[PDB]
Design an enzyme around this catalytic site. Structure first.
Site: not given
Lengths: 343, 331, 335
Positions: A78-79, A107, A128, A156
């Site tokens: 959804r996000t 990395k 996110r 959120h």
């Protein structure tokens, strides 16, 4: 972009959208505390506009020629998809980094440097990460605004924004801060780990709201959050001994609430298998469980769901979680428009 | 804005149709199985594809579907179909959101197909979906409030593959469409007829026309009975069935005789196509292969003018542009 | 049609027709830095500078609209990959991304019918050259196994030319001195940048541990190119063990990464990892005009304090990759 929609013109808190945009330009939205009262109202009005524009197939292209980076280092539908859709329907473009480990994206490169570099190519970043803390490193390093799309079990914020919009829709008095018009919410399930619960409860505590927290012991709402709720309700004189109540079953937690906020029991976070199986099956919302709610009760869920709401509840007119999800499009279009628009 | 087919007058007088109204009626159709495409829809698909093929080749403007947004959901890995569809979207002037696997997605946490599609439908105008599952695609279609194009599934439907296959064949043998008892196409399908869905589904489509089939395989990799029946059925419906209609062989020299089309399959080795194997075929013979090819066709054959498998693949672009335009354009 | 500032000044200064150079670049693949000649380099550098000016004034950057590119990265990348994509988006074109047993030849033969061009990173030596002969469309090499990465050398050189424009004049009186520091044996951006810089009047200080010395093949190509323009002296190339001698009288310090993956085990790596660490203290000796580059990412080799030093430009360098990749897409693909 003119606000002509039937909520803004009836609203009694009229606003200067130009002034609010100036204030909002290039703001990062990391926690829900980054959005004040007037910002919220601007989001909500502007969200209705975009809803109206889309529902009437009119031209939605009010933010053209921006380029955003979308960085999702954990799973999302959804996000992630709704941000992208919002970006594209506004007339702007998106670059996607969708890489399933925080480890193999940093990395041997510091977050600091990554966000230093990455910010040079783009106007904004959506971010996110299953880490609580990385978004904070990113905000300080970046030369461009960040919208946090979920930082671990932290917050959120845009979830809380679209949740509130959905609530306001059904219960418009939530904005009035009128001591005789209290909204009652039940948050059910993973209160400890639910970043949506965290953001929405802090947001709602700024208004006239009482809270039912329905959880099994290990997923109880964190104490820091009840202190934040408690403090905020005291600020506007909506605090009493009845403001916050704790329940470990549905029957009681659901009484006299306007909103049921269901949540997923986050399997990924459990170590004891038996403890997971037990918690998983504690709170299951069914038409039977709903018989004793208020008639005006509305059912939210940030999604995705596993077994916590039976499919039969989708046909019950009390369930609005699919509409709630739909609204994310409109709310995220509004947030982006307000922040990133030109002067 | 509005796509014009060249020579609309001649195509409407030849087939006895109104192509403008066929095209209009395709708005919002979902295309999951080749049986979703009737006789008139196929003509429209075919001529809308040629048109896009003309456009792109004369470096003209192909932006006939602007301001749409699509979600492309690919839960198998793919290369050519995925890319092909995104290229078609982008050349039409639309935009695309991509899912290219389950793990980056809320499926990871156990979301159902029903839920995920109910929601994705609200963000976009349409959905292209590939999924090795047998039934996820059908679930997606009842859950979805927007049209879906099936880019390949586990029941072996891959309808844009069979449409581009058809478009390639029609290009070199246009009489396929005419259903004229004097002009039969002959095709040899060769290889893993058992596993190649692509054969099954193109078989089903070709058998609606005056065609005959040579199937060339091991006893192990024979063509399925269900598929013969459908071929037999469909041919009988337009009186093209006779005892000749379906030959069966176990070597090329015999199988490749008097075929207009050779359709090689991926084996997923008595059937390795070569210049030598090709000496005794007809002169007009074209060779197809849905791709990729391991060694079932030797690289020498690419030079032979009977090879058209790369042109076949290129045709996926025009066909997918046509299908997106027909399903999703406004009025 | 992009217009270049000082187009005619530049033509009379270098004895070139830029326009004709730009035009002739249509459909060129760019695989190795030796495929860029003197005149093509001028064209890329001034074209990059125009996109730099244009983006810094929030002007219209949309000089390559309606093209579709495939981007094929068969190894992890973010800085290179994103930069190309941003370059594409900001020119007003679109990209398809592959970030990830058919022949390469077949794959590129099909893929090039869908797209106007292709950007390809593959750690194989072979595949990119295969792709180029199989593809009907131009390819930009984004990095391959043969150590070739031409847009990195182009952006490195663009960065240096920004601060020392004389690098292009081949003026016997105006010599650029550069220190390359760290892993010279494996640092393939050094090899490539060295070869390109050696076409101009440049002096080289190679600063490394013994076992990480510059390879004799590179020295040779350098020596060859310098001798070709009459810029070679026994002073053209110097070798050093240490930074304080190393960094003396250099216009440019180019730090390399020390790549853990290139050593047998973590013990060997560690032999070298901290040997050369640039700090503000080690920068006290340098000239006032000294600029510090690093292709990135870094680990310990440049201390964070150096970022605030006005000598550091590694982040501006990374940013320059945008203007250069835009320029290159422009010159290769536009009508």
């Amino acid at each position: 972009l003119k606000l002509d929609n039937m909520f803004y013109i009836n609203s009694k808190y009229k606003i200067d959208l130009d002034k609010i945009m100036t204030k909002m330009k290039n703001k990062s939205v990391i926690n829900i505390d980054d959005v004040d009262d007037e910002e919220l109202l601007a989001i909500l009005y502007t969200s209705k506009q975009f809803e109206k524009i889309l529902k009437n197939n009119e031209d939605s292209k009010y933010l053209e020629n921006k380029v955003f980076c979308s960085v999702f280092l954990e799973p999302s539908t959804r996000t992630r998809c709704s941000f992208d859709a919002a970006i594209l329907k506004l007339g702007s473009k998106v670059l996607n980094i969708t890489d399933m480990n925080s480890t193999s994206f940093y990395k041997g490169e510091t977050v600091e440097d990554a966000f230093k570099i990455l910010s040079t190519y783009v106007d904004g970043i959506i971010y996110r990460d299953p880490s609580k803390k990385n978004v904070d490193i990113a905000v300080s390093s970046s030369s461009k605004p960040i919208i946090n799309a979920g930082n671990g079990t932290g917050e959120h914020p845009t979830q809380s924004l679209l949740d509130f919009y959905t609530i306001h829709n059904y219960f418009p008095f939530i904005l009035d801060r009128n001591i005789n018009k209290k909204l009652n919410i039940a948050f059910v399930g993973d209160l400890k780990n639910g970043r949506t619960v965290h953001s929405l409860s802090k947001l709602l505590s700024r208004y006239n709201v009482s809270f039912n927290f329905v959880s099994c012991k290990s997923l109880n709402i964190p104490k820091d959050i009840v202190n934040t709720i408690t403090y905020n309700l005291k600020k506007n004189n909506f605090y009493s001994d009845d403001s916050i109540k704790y329940f470990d079953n549905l029957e009681e937690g659901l009484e006299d609430v306007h909103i049921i906020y269901m949540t997923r029991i986050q399997k990924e976070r459990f170590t004891d298998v038996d403890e997971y199986n037990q918690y998983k099956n504690a709170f299951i919302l069914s038409n039977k469980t709903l018989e004793n709610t208020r008639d005006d009760t509305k059912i939210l869920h940030p999604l995705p769901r596993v077994n916590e709401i039976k499919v039969e509840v989708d046909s019950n007119p009390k369930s609005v979680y699919f509409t709630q999800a739909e609204n994310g499009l409109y709310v995220r279009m509004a947030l982006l428009y307000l922040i990133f628009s030109s002067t």
